[PDB]
């Protein structure tokens, strides 16, 4: 088993899109429709677990929003996309991230949104 934290790191850490989505194995069983990569240090992202507590989209209370904006990339599939040619539009932005944190140590296990 990978672990949710490791999966989080695989899917969302990258201190473009077709290639990274391929590299991280997000085009494997299918083309994952959308995914965000974060271009900050792992430590900066992990510290988010002690920042602004906010509700998760699913209604759980263990989500956290970064006090600072962070450099991210949104990968969002194109219409012309078909596996194994999964095709993605890349969109850069600087936004606050919201992640769900769990476990001991208390670390990100889910990317919820950016604002």
From Swiss-Prot:
Quaternary data: Interacts with and forms tight 1:1 complexes with RNH1. Dimerization of two such complexes may occur. Interaction with RNH1 inhibits this protein. Monomer.
Cellular component GO terms, alphabetical: extracellular region
Enzyme superclass (EC): lyase
Alphabetically ordered keywords of this record: Disulfide bond, Endonuclease, Glycation, Glycoprotein, Hydrolase, Lyase, Nuclease, Secreted, Signal
Function: Endonuclease that catalyzes the cleavage of RNA on the 3' side of pyrimidine nucleotides. Acts on single-stranded and double-stranded RNA.
Annotated glycosylation sites: 1, 7, 25, 28, 32
Catalytic activity: an [RNA] containing cytidine + H2O = an [RNA]-3'-cytidine-3'-phosphate + a 5'-hydroxy-ribonucleotide-3'-[RNA]; an [RNA] containing uridine + H2O = an [RNA]-3'-uridine-3'-phosphate + a 5'-hydroxy-ribonucleotide-3'-[RNA]
GO molecular function: lyase activity; nucleic acid binding; ribonuclease A activity; RNA nuclease activity
Resulting phenotype, residue 12 to A: Loss of activity
Name the record gives this protein: Ribonuclease pancreatic
Cellular location(s): Secreted
EC number: 4.6.1.18
Active site (UniProt): 12 (proton acceptor), 110 (proton donor)
GO biological process entries: defense response to Gram-positive bacterium
